[PDB]
Amino acid sequence: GSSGSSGTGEKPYNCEECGKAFIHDSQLQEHQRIHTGEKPSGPSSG
């Protein structure tokens, strides 16, 4: 698993709750909201 060896795979933002990268803040924030609330039935893994 290269795990980011060479290429284009980086973002100034990232979710330390699920593992989703974001190019901008507004984007990430608009997502982190899903965690603050009551997570659905599925992503309840890690």
Q: Which residues of this protein are in contact with Zn ion, per CB under 5 A? A: 15, 17-18, 20
Q: Could you tell me if 27 and 14 are in contact, meaning their C-beta atoms sit under 8 angstroms apart? A: no
* 13 vs 18, beta carbon nearer Zn ion: 18
Find all residues with CB under 8 Å of 2, minimum gap 6, and list them.
none
Could you tell me the smallest distance in angstroms from the CB atom of residue 30 to Zn ion?
11
* 13 vs 17, beta carbon nearer Zn ion: 17
* 20 vs 27, beta carbon nearer Zn ion: 20
Structure tokens at 36: 């603050």
